[PDB]
Ligand binder design. Structure first.
Ligand SMILES: [Ca+2]
Ligand SMILES: [Ca+2]
Ligand SMILES: [Ca+2]
Ligand SMILES: [Ca+2]
Ligand SMILES: [Ca+2]
Ligand SMILES: [Ca+2]
Length: 1370
């Protein structure tokens, strides 16, 4: 009769106290447990615990569940924060016998009238006012079908907090609505809800109401506890909206769920002007009231719409895959810079279209090179720079605290001594002191200050001055390094939390990729990260003017992703238009805008010479051709001048080339070759697949341009189109084959290794242009440009004044630095398994700017050792030498599983920064498959600046030794120190698992897997009856490193031996560190208690006394491995030994006396009796219950049997008899008897101080003390003893009987002198004396309340050793 309780504890909100480290001590009917340690006032425990107890269901469904959450400081005891006492039967009677995600109150018995001590969210199981004043909105996207231009939206604001929902008035046909309404939320503070849900809703008269956006207001970010505590206030300020893309094409939008609030929004949706105050009364009331004209005038002083100037320098666009057509990049902030509305000036906000080209190993890149496209925008946003200067200062001190923190841990991992790390935490703290004594921006004189700005100003100055005084307290109070470490994360978490600015009305810069009209990949760089301030470097953004590495993501990508789209390096800049002069300090390179015109000519098929025959177009024109533009149509603007003359000009070790194929058929037919069958990468007639040859100085080493199928195509490798009028050629290709299609396109691969005046030509005007004259051309044009640069008296700040141009903007570099990268890739670990053999074939593609390579494949191994250096010869980086050194481009190493058939699969990527050290050591970079880590990689990267730069005209140490020919090896001094170890192995048993895979653990066996040197132990033949391995000793040898960072954790694995190959892998193990593996009998009974009157002269005749343990036995102070699951942790155990060098027993339980019981019954009687459950056996001692006594004398005999480990536990209870009701419980206590046998002392039989054959000290152990010490000599390899009449030898040392009985009476009960002295020697071996356990019980209703004491003593002897002595009476 057993029942089980499942308790799942999720989170807590608004806990009492400050800076706490809470944890939940869940207790079910006296059985205690503990959850995971967490941080802050809002913990996120998410743990699951289980309990079980043996009793009737009528006695288990009345028990309480305890959710006792306490604050647990590292040097302080548990202080109570929450406690409740719900009933198990209130879970059991309800449906599912369970609660699911129920919100719970918290309370404290210090003051129950205080109400909520926070909240909690939990799941059980049983097994067998706010015055929200909304003013206006603007830039709301179209959501009604056209046939007023952009006013196709009917918005109204719905606000829902704490479950109560309200709505605003509808305003039809307006993209800039003017509500000016007040909505009073009746939610009493606090509640279970923390975050406010606000949606603008497009009203529809006939269909369902579409959703515009959803923004969130976290109340803890706008409120404080506390005198420095205030009710949540917000506004009047704009909050930005994010969701689906703005382009209303009709149809169901595939990114519809983005604007419902879930996931990061992909595009700007407008903004809401709103405020909130707390008119908090307990008289709950809600209403929507139209404002008078007085409330509108107060918000107009906050809308100081300054002009904002935006800069974006696109340095590189690499890492690119699945390229379709030319790729351009659009920069926008808010609705300014959205290229689909066609309202902007012809400068627009996008880079020019660029066809990607294959980089030579795996990826593609845009070949910008020395010309970087530039996007410059103008916008109108409010002057919120007082807020942004605050949060850039707080984030700035935060990231120098964080980088200094891992700098301290870097020296600790480098084993620097105590005085170097003293200097590192010293320079951490005084630089923190200078950064924090920097004064905050006063907000008192600024009329754009709201209520929340003034409240955060007092909050920030008070709290950061507390950081200052704590830093001075650590400056003289020199504690230990861990004690300063807990403080170090404390001010870091405080500074990051205070740095939140909920009134950030500046929208994030949404940088986009467009492949045609299709928006593909995005990132929202925050506007605070790039905004400029006049006040200095500490108040500027982190990437304000600095080069920023950005990894774009797909829409609705809640993950880092499997296929990364692209990697960009943008030199973003933002700031005031009056502060745009300060861009001159940040800029580098000759910023240019090319004045341009096109002069066109023609030659038809019957002409033969270039002239004007057949050109129905203007001669001098733009790139469109139809619109005339002469040479002097583009002139220098205000601040510009020409920088040159008119001219006629357009813009490593291995490589891999891609070849292409093309065919055609009729509908209903079969595929045949066309005339254009061997063509170029776009599909037009060029030199064939074999006429493209190797250039001079290189050689082929692939035998043939081979077939390829590693792409998104069908089974035959083709992608298919249909013929579309008016041209004779198809237009849109899709990678599936259907019956309609008339053309198809294939691909190929090969590889190789290293040992007319500027005219452009086209087949027809407006058709496909290229830079060379070939046989298919009949039209042409020439590329006039003249370079224009800003005046030197204004610098590169003059680009922002390019308004009224009617052009491309490009940061031309006259030079580029030359660099040389080496990627020391030694080994990896813990990688995912992808193939059917539970292994993988890892090879790592390593990329750096455009150049990429890949390592060799290590076949069928999850712990590869490539030992390979990928050498990137002559990679060029543009910019200043100092700029690219401090901000190197990000090396991204992604691992892939090689498949001989099919396609390769993703294994995980890591982002690393190359070190400029001349020999930088290896480190572990954690691989991620996006949603989870999938291993670690022992790599290192070295980036060397070379001797000379490569000049672009105006239009190293030795290589390492080779492991294999043409494959470089990671060098000797950088390699980890592998060395020869021989390990002696022990395996003796396993303890304490649960069930696994629909069955119990019947016959487990163990395999040791250190470094691939596999050894296997024997099998525990049946663990449920004996948990013992057959064979003790084993041997193995393992290749192992010397430093614990580089060293592999030990992989052990345990497999259940089930029949016919059906063995389940029931567990694994991970050893984190290896530092541990290099006168009558009643005269004796009352003398032990202390009752002299009933003892008599037993004490005065020099007899012994056993130890009556009035408290529990755990007060006595008297290798082990732990089984590991991947997710919760510790599940079981294993016993053995590793030395690194260069089962049934007889039981006799006696229950004799109890005392200290209370009169539980209201008439004053307590009637106790025992109940002990050991396996199948149960005690039904109600037959001999003792009525109406506080101190009963049971005095009974219980002969029993036990087997390890199912019957190793002794749980004993007491119940009090009742008249008509069920016998109520008194208490319980437990002992685990396995550790008494497991100990090397052999502490099973407690030792009397002298040996006696009979009498009170009559022997009980299976062997006499001489044979016991001889057993100690065989077990611990001590030399065998020699016994005489008077003296006894141990460790060949001579001990005599006068050490025992000097001044003591030689009682006639005493046995042989050999047994007296040998028993004395085991007393010197640390053996416990004789045991009687008078263990205090504990209340199930309260684990801190004792419930009397219960005296007992237990015999336990495994029958294989011998026959124990006969029992005696009590
Ligand atoms: Ca609609
Ligand atoms: Ca509508
Ligand atoms: Ca595979
Ligand atoms: Ca594979
Ligand atoms: Ca009773
Ligand atoms: Ca009673």
């Amino acid at each position: 009769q057993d029942f089980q309780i499942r308790v799942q504890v999720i989170e807590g909100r608004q806990l009492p106290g400050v800076n706490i480290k809470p944890v939940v001590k869940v207790t079910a009917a006296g059985q205690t447990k503990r959850t995971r340690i967490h941080k802050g006032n809002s913990p996120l425990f998410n743990e699951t615990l289980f309990f079980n107890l043996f009793d009737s269901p009528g006695e288990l469904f009345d028990e309480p569940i305890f959710i006792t959450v306490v604050d647990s400081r590292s040097l302080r005891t548990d202080a109570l924060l929450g406690e409740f006492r719900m009933d198990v039967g209130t879970i059991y009677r309800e449906p599912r016998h369970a609660y699911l995600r129920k919100w719970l109150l918290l309370s404290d018995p210090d003051d129950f009238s205080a109400g909520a001590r926070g909240y909690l969210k939990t799941s059980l199981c049983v097994l067998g006012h706010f015055c929200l004043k909304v003013f206006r909105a603007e830039d709301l996207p179209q959501m009604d079908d056209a046939v007023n231009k952009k006013n196709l939206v009917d918005p109204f604001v719905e606000v829902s907090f704490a479950g109560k929902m309200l709505c605003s008035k509808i305003l039809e046909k307006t993209a800039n609505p003017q509500w000016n309404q007040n909505i009073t939320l009746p939610a009493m503070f606090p509640s279970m809800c923390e975050k406010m849900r606000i949606r603008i809703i497009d009203w529809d008269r006939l269909t369902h109401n579409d959703i515009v956006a959803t923004t969130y207001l976290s109340m803890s970010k706008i409120s404080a506890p506390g005198y420095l505590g205030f009710l949540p206030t917000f506004g009047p300020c704009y909050i930005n909206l994010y969701g689906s893309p703005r382009e209303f094409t009709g149809f169901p939008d595939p990114y519809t769920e983005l604007n419902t609030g879930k996931g990061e929004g992909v595009a700007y949706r407008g903004r809401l002007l709103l405020s909130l105050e707390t008119k908090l009364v307990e008289h709950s009331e809600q209403k929507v009231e139209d404002l008078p004209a007085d409330d509108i005038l107060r918000v107009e002083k906050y809308l100081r719409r300054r002009k904002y100037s935006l800069f974006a320098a696109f340095y590189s666009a690499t890492m690119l895959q699945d390229v379709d057509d030319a790729i351009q990049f659009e920069v926008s902030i808010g609705n300014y810079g959205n290229k689909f509305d066609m309202t902007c000036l012809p400068l627009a906000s996008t880079t020019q279209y660029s066809r990607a080209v294959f980089d030579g190993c795996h990826y593609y890149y845009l070949p910008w090179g020395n010309v970087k496209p530039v996007v410059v925008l103008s916008s109108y946003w409010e002057d919120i720079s007082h807020r942004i200067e605050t949060q850039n200062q707080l984030l700035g001190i935060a990231d120098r605290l964080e980088a200094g923190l891992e700098q301290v841990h870097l020296a600790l991992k480098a084993q620097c001594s105590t005085e170097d790390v003293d200097s590192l935490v010293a320079q951490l703290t005084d630089e923190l002191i200078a950064g924090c004594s920097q004064p905050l921006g006063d907000i008192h004189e600024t009329p754009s200050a709201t209520h929340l700005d003034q409240y955060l100003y007092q909050l920030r100055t008070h709290h950061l001055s507390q950081i200052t005084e704590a830093a001075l307290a650590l400056k003289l109070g020199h504690s230990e390094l861990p004690a300063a470490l807990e403080q170090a994360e404390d001010w870091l978490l405080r500074l990051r939390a205070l740095a939140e600015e909920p009134q950030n009305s500046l929208p994030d810069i949404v940088i986009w990729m467009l492949q045609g009209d299709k928006r593909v990949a995005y990132q929202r760089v925050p506007a605070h990260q790039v905004l400029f301030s006049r006040r200095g470097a500490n108040y500027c953004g982190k990437n304000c003017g600095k080069l920023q590495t950005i990894f774009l993501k797909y829409p609705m990508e809640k993950v880092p992703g499997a296929r990364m789209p692209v990697q960009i390096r943008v030199k973003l800049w933002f700031g005031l238009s009056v502060d745009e002069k300060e861009f001159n300090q940040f800029a580098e390179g000759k910023l240019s805008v090319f004045a341009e015109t096109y002069e066109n000519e023609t030659k038809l098929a019957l002409v033969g010479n270039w002239g004007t025959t057949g050109l129905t177009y203007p001669k001098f024109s733009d790139v469109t051709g139809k619109i005339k533009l002469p040479k002097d149509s583009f002139r220098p603007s205000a601040g510009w001048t020409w920088a040159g003359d008119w001219f006629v000009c357009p813009e490593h070790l291995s490589f891999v080339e891609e070849v292409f194929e093309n065919q055609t058929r009729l509908p209903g037919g079969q595929w045949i070759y066309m005339s254009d069958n061997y063509t170029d990468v776009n599909g037009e007639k060029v030199l064939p697949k074999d006429d493209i040859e190797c250039p001079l100085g290189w050689k082929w080493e692939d035998e043939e341009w081979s077939t390829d199928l590693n792409r998104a195509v069908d089974e035959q490798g083709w992608e298919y189109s249909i013929t579309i009028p008016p041209e004779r050629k198809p237009k849109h290709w899709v990678p599936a084959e259907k019956m309609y299609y008339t053309h198809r396109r294939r691909r190929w691969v090969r590889l190789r290794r290293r040992d007319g005046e500027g005219w452009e030509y086209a087949s027809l005007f407006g058709w496909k242009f290229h830079l060379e004259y070939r046989k298919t051309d009949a039209f042409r044009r020439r590329r006039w440009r003249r370079r224009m640069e800003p005046l030197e008296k204004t610098g590169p700040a003059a680009v922002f004044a390019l308004e009224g141009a009617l052009p491309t903007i490009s940061c031309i570099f006259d030079y580029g630095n030359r660099y040389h990268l080496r990627c020391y890739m030694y080994q990896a670990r813990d990688l995912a398994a992808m193939d059917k053999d539970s292994f993988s074939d890892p090879y790592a593609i390593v990329s750096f700017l455009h150049q990429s390579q890949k390592t060799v494949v290590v076949k069928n191994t999850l712990n590869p050792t490539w030992d390979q250096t990928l050498i990137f010869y002559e990679i060029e980086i543009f910019g200043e030498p100092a700029t690219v050194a401090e901000q190197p481009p990000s090396i991204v190493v992604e691992l892939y599983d090689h498949d001989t058939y099919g396609a390769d699969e993703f294994m995980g990527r890591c982002i690393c920064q190359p070190s400029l050290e001349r020999m930088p050591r290896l480190a572990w970079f954690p691989l991620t498959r996006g949603s989870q880590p999938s291993g670690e990689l022992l790599a290192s990267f070295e980036l060397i600046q070379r001797e000379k730069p490569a000049i672009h005209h105006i239009p190293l140490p030795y290589p390492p030794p080779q492991r294999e020919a043409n494959i470089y090896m990671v060098p000797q001094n950088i390699k980890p120190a592998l060395q020869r170890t021989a390990i002696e192995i022990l395996a003796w048993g396993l303890r304490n698992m649960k069930s696994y895979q629909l069955a119990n653990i019947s016959s487990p066996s163990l395999v040791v897997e250190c470094g691939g040197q596999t050894v296997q132990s024997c099998v525990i033949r049946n663990l449920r009856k004996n948990p013992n391995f057959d064979i003790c000793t084993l041997f193995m040898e393992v290749m192992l490193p010397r430093e614990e960072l580089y060293c592999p954790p030990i992989t052990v694995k345990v497999i259940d031996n089930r029949q016919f190959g059906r063995r389940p892998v029931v567990g694994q193990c991970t050893i984190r560190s290896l530092e541990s593996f290099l006168i009558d009998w009643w005269s004796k009974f009352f003398a032990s208690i202390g009752e002299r009157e009933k003892c008599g002269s037993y004490l005065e005749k020099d007899f012994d006394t056993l130890k009556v343990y009035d408290t529990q036995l755990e007060n006595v102070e008297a290798n082990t491995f732990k089984l590991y699951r991947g997710k919760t942790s510790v599940i079981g155990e294993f016993k053995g030994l590793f030395k690194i060098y260069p089962q049934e027993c007889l039981v006799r339980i006696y229950i004799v006396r109890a005392f200290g019981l209370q009169p539980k019954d209201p008439n004053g009687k307590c009637d106790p009796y025992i109940k002990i459950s050991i396996g199948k056996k149960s005690v039904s001692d109600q037959d001999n219950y003792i009525p109406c006594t506080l101190e009963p004398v049971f005095g009974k005999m219980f002969e029993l049997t036990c087997t390890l480990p199912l019957e190793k536990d002794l749980k004993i209870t007491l119940y009090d008899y009742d008249l008509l009701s069920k016998d109520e419980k008194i208490g319980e206590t437990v002992v685990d008897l396995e550790n008494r046998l497991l100990s090397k002392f052999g502490a099973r039989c407690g030792l009397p101080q002298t040996y006696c054959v009979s009498g009170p000290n009559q022997w009980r152990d299976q062997l006499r003390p001489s044979q016991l010490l001889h057993l100690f000599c065989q077990q611990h390899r001590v030399k065998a003893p020699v016994y005489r009449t008077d003296r006894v030898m141990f460790q060949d040392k001579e001990y005599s009987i006068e050490e025992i009985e000097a001044g003591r009476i030689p009682n006639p009960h005493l046995g042989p002198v050999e047994e007296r002295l040998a028993l004395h020697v085991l007393q010197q071996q640390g053996l416990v004396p004789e045991h009687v356990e008078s263990r205090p019980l504990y209340s199930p209703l309260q684990p801190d309340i004792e419930q009397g004491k219960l005296q007992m003593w237990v015999d336990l002897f495994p029958k294989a050793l011998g026959r124990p002595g006969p029992p005696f009476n009590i």
